[PDB]
Amino acid sequence: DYLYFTTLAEAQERMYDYLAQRDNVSAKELKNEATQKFYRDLAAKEIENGGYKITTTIDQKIHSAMQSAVADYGYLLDDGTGRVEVGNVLMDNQTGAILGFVGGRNYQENQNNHAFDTKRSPASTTKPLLAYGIAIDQGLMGSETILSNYPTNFANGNPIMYANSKGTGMMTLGEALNYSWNIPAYWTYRMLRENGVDVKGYMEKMGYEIPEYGIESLPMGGGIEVTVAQHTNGYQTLANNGVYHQKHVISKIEAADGRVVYEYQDKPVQVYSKATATIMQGLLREVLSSRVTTTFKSNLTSLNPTLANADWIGKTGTTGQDENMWLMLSTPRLTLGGWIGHDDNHSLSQQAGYSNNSNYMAHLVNAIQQASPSIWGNERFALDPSVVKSEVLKSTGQKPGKVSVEGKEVEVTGSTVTSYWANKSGAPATSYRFAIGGSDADYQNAWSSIVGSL
Numbered sequence: 012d013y014l015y016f017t018t019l020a021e022a023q024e025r026m027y028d029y030l031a032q033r034d035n036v037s038a039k040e041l042k043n044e045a046t047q048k049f050y051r052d053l054a055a056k057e058i059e060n061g062g063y064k065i066t067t068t069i070d071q072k073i074h075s076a077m078q079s080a081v082a083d084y085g086y087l088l089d090d091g092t093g094r095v096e097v098g099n100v101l102m103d104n105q106t107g108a109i110l111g112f113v114g115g116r117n118y119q120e121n122q123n124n125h126a127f128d129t130k131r132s133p134a135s136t137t138k139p140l141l142a143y144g145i146a147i148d149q150g151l152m153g154s155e156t157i158l159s160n161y162p163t164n165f166a167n168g169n170p171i172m173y174a175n176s177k178g179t180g181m182m183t184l185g186e187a188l189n190y191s192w193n194i195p196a197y198w199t200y201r202m203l204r205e206n207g208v209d210v211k212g213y214m215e216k217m218g219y220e221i222p223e224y225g226i227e228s229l230p231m232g233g234g235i236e237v238t239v240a241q242h243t244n245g246y247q248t249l250a251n252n253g254v255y256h257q258k259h260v261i262s263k264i265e266a267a268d269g270r271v272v273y274e275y276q277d278k279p280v281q282v283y284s285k286a287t288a289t290i291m292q293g294l295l296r297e298v299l300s301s302r303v304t305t306t307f308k309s310n311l312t313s314l315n316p317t318l319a320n321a322d323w324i325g326k327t328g329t330t331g332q333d334e335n336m337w338l339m340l341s342t343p344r345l346t347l348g349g350w351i352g353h354d355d356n357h358s359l360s361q362q363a364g365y366s367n368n369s370n371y372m373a374h375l376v377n378a379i380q381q382a383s384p385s386i387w388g389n390e391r392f393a394l395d396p397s398v399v400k401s402e403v404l405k406s407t408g409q410k411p412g413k414v415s416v417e418g419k420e421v422e423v424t425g426s427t428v429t430s431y432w433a434n435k436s437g438a439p440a441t442s443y444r445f446a447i448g449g450s451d452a453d454y455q456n457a458w459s460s461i462v463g464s465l
């Protein structure tokens with residue numbers, strides 16, 4: 012089954028490193044293709060013949076419950092576009108340990124491992140990690156910052172689209188995330204590029220490989236393809252108050268006589284500040300509660316109302332032609348990554364991610380809890396003490412004060428709201444260009460509307 016071959020493949024790679032070091036093979040010698048083939052074959056025979064003890068992070072009751080869940084409820088994914096394939100990884104947020112996974116609908120019918128082997132764009136689940144999370148971390152935005160969703164074009168003249176919408180106007184970060192509007196994510200990433208932020212530094216600390224960081228649609232998942240296991244590791248980082256632990260299934264390999272061939276070594280990395288991570292947790296809580304892009308909270312409330320009252324956060328994604336849907340879920344204890352799609356990349360139904368994957372993942376979450384009642388935990392995500400709280404205008408996401416609007420000094424007042432920041436000073440005073448992004452026309456239409464209201 013999936014677990015046997017995933018474990019065997021990883022143990023063979025660790026045995027390869029061990030044997031080459033044992034036999035004092037130089038890194039140069041190791042570049043020789045014939046030497047490499049010999050050491051791969053030797054590693055395979057050592058595992059096959061050698062009576063090694065492989066210790067995995069797999070919780071057998073949970074992993075077994077996940078296999079029964081996809082066997083019993085995988086048909087809930089079938090949406091009239093043929094048999095829908097699936098990958099899920101359940102990860103301990105404090106360690107990066109993989110407790111269980113779903114490799115696909117049925118190993119016996121299709122052996123492709125959709126948790127560890129298959130790479131697809133994570134689509135709009137990129138946004139919290141690569142755009143908004145980094146912007147907050149760099150003190151370029153807070154929880155109630157305003158972004159432009161006004162119509163705008165990619166460099167090649169194509170409109171930035173969201174379903175059939177060419178865009179609306181100004182909106183909060185919260186609305187931008189709840190809906191997964193695309194234009195606000197585009198502007199956030201353009202701001203990071205313009206400011207020369209080392210985005211690669213963040214993404215590589217979490218083990219992502221992105222070839223071209225200049226892609227305009229990077230936050231929407233253009234120019235990124237990931238395994239479910241890797242992408243689960245990204246969300247583990249946000250859930251774990253910004254501290255990455257490298258994903259692993261193997262914790263140790265020992266010879267029969269107890270000599271250590273390999274032992275996983277924890278190497279925690281603070282990728283985002285605690286302020287940034289805990290702010291993003293609060294935003295991703297509302298993504299699920301708002302139910303705009305996923306029915307997950309409705310599905311889970313019906314299956315298991317007590318589990319639905321755990322502190323769920325997450326994010327959805329849909330690739331361009333609905334070929335791939337994602338739902339990433341966390342409680343403080345665990346992250347569960349979910350992909351669905353077709354092996355031949357053809358389109359899913361329009362609602363496959365919104366409804367079908369949401370219902371299936373509610374069933375998977377329920378099966379995990381029934382197998383291991385305390386595993387999700389009852390702990391809440393909470394704002395770090397280092398978070399800065401700023402009273403800002405609802406209309407500008409910045410502090411009340413004076414702005415020049417067409418000659419005339421204007422006193423900007425009105426509804427205020429607490430905005431969470433991950434810098435020292437918090438939110439700035441309202442300036443004319445108060446939003447992330449927008450044209451001089453957009454600002455003319457945003458200020459008309461705000462001036463109208465004073």
Ligand SMILES: *C(=O)[C@@H](NC(=O)[C@H](Cc1ccccc1)NC(=O)CCCCCN=[N+]=[N-])[C@@H](C)O
Pocket residue numbers: 132134135136172173174190191192193228231232233327328329330331332
């Ligand atoms: C996040 O899930 C958003 N998805 C997108 O914006 C995707 C990004 C993407 C595109 C291709 C591969 C991988 C990722 N793009 C679109 O949805 C664009 C829609 C098509 C409009 C242009 N029509 N044409 N031709 C989600 C919230 O939209």
Ligand SMILES: [Cl-]
Pocket residue numbers: 012013014015078114
């Ligand atoms: Cl398996």
Ligand SMILES: [Cl-]
Pocket residue numbers: 012013014015016017114124
């Ligand atoms: Cl496998």
Ligand SMILES: [Cl-]
Pocket residue numbers: 069070071072
């Ligand atoms: Cl176990």
Ligand SMILES: [Cl-]
Pocket residue numbers: 130131132236330335
């Ligand atoms: Cl893809």
Ligand SMILES: [Cl-]
Pocket residue numbers: 162163164165
């Ligand atoms: Cl434009």
Ligand SMILES: [Cl-]
Pocket residue numbers: 185186189190301
């Ligand atoms: Cl909203």
Ligand SMILES: [Cl-]
Pocket residue numbers: 208209210211212224
């Ligand atoms: Cl970069």
Ligand SMILES: [Cl-]
Pocket residue numbers: 218219220221236237238241
């Ligand atoms: Cl990657």
Ligand SMILES: [Cl-]
Pocket residue numbers: 223224225
């Ligand atoms: Cl670059």
Ligand SMILES: [Cl-]
Pocket residue numbers: 021258259260261
């Ligand atoms: Cl591993």
Ligand SMILES: [Cl-]
Pocket residue numbers: 266267268269
């Ligand atoms: Cl031995």
Ligand SMILES: [Cl-]
Pocket residue numbers: 281283284285286
């Ligand atoms: Cl910190």
Ligand SMILES: [Cl-]
Pocket residue numbers: 299300308
């Ligand atoms: Cl809710």
Ligand SMILES: [Cl-]
Pocket residue numbers: 302305306309
């Ligand atoms: Cl709903």
Ligand SMILES: [Cl-]
Pocket residue numbers: 316317320
């Ligand atoms: Cl309860």
